[PDB]
Write a protein that binds this ligand. Structure first.
Ligand SMILES: Nc1cc(S(=O)(=O)O)cc2cc(S(=O)(=O)O)cc(O)c12
Ligand SMILES: Nc1cc(S(=O)(=O)O)cc2cc(S(=O)(=O)O)cc(O)c12
Ligand SMILES: [Cl-]
Ligand SMILES: [Cl-]
Lengths: 242, 242
């Protein structure tokens, strides 16, 4: 059910990088990875936690819908796209942390713990601040655990309303053309070592769905584009995308 | 509220074509078109009727969800992509008429007419064959009436369940990148003159949505790509997409 394909390491080696890419063939129920050990190594989810955070916020009514505007708090921050009004779609697209920190505070630690346990999400640990535990707290999730969570979300099997799951899957939309649809979420963990970058999601084809979860060492923010580039090179080699 | 911009006609003249493009700015509540008269002239919806047909099939339970497989009936047809199994997403993507003719037969004339009346869709006339009235029957819809219908769908305002509307909006996904999301449906009306090609939908931006409905004279299937091409040129001229 799991298979190691160490040939994908050349895509990491070419860009002087190191990480793991995990693929899941939904039709055949088979998994593939270049490093089974790192595939099961649990890291801070960083901004990939915006997927479960969105689900909980929508199911609890903290977020009314994907169109509700969340005004900029006026604090000018270092990322320019953060200093503006956002809805759920654009907050996920630009990884607007302060918007989701506001969501987490309204959710509260008690409901956040209960929901993450219902989601079977990682180690289900929210130790630290309720509005930063996915950035510098105790929550840890592996690439294979991201796949298991994403597979439940795809099939609407999470312990939330179907509506919340459909809205979040819409907000995860990243790329779409005549060949494939990518619903995914980026992540960048910097507060706690090791500094890593995430990209988790799935590729929808006409007759199949390929779930993917990747993470890689990210000492500097200059290599952040390699998350999508290395993943797409693996997808191209596997004939998943042209 | 409505403004005519005849400069768009140059994009039709460049390809030796004739048609109308209707744009609606949702934030500003203004509309723009190159031909006010043709914008309100009613044509056969052709495969753009797959939007309301999908909504009706979903709300009535004829289609359970976007994953239900509709098996190929075995008859080899002219369009190769039709000679295979389909779900709601691929049937919309490839405009698989035989799949939607089966939907219309299951829906029936009484339910179809009741729903189109509730939708305020076009002239609400289902006269003709139960499984082809949108291709050669009495139903007619204008480009502005398409936008009016699409605006209700975007806001989950149609009388069907919100779930049915969210599923159809997902199935309408055509293109997505870091700049915009296009949810649209193509159409090609050939059985009754004038032969016309349709493209209706909307473009999702970060803080606005531009609804569009275009139709153009289409004597042959060779120029079907001009529907998107001319629409994109108008969108680029109005600085909606880069
Ligand atoms: N929370 C964050 C997510 C992402 S994402 O590309 O994975 O979505 C990138 C980030 C980049 C920076 S910075 O170092 O460039 O200022 C800081 C962040 O907090 C980020
Ligand atoms: N139902 C149809 C929809 C479309 S669409 O691109 O507007 O969706 C194109 C079509 C082209 C042909 S043909 O002339 O190439 O045989 C035949 C069709 O039935 C079509
Ligand atoms: Cl979508
Ligand atoms: Cl032409």
């Amino acid at each position: 059910m799991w298979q190691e394909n160490k040939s994908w390491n050349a895509h990491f080696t070419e860009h002087k990088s190191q990480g793991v890419v995990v693929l899941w063939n939904e039709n055949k129920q088979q998994g593939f990875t270049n490093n089974l050990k790192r595939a099961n190594q649990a890291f801070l989810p960083a901004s990939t936690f915006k997927i479960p955070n969105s689900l909980i916020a929508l199911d609890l009514g903290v977020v009314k819908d994907e169109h509700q505007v969340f005004k900029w708090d006026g604090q000018t921050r270092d990322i320019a796209t953060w200093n503006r009004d956002h809805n759920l779609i654009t907050a996920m697209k630009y990884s607007v942390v302060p918007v989701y920190q506001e969501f987490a505070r309204q959710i509260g630690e008690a409901r956040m713990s209960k929901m993450l346990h219902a989601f079977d999400y990682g180690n289900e640990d929210i130790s630290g601040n309720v509005d930063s535990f996915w950035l510098d707290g105790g929550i840890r999730i592996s690439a294979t655990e991201q796949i298991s969570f994403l597979r439940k979300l795809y099939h609407n099997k999470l312990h939330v309303s179907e509506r919340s799951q459909r809205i979040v899957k819409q907000a995860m939309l990243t790329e779409a053309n005549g060949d494939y649809i990518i619903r995914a979420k980026t992540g960048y963990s910097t507060r706690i070592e090791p500094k890593i970058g995430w990209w988790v999601g799935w590729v929808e084809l006409d007759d199949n769905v390929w779930f993917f979860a990747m993470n890689m060492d990210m000492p500097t923010s200059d290599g952040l584009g390699l998350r999508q580039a290395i993943t797409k090179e693996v997808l191209k080699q596997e004939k998943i995308i042209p």
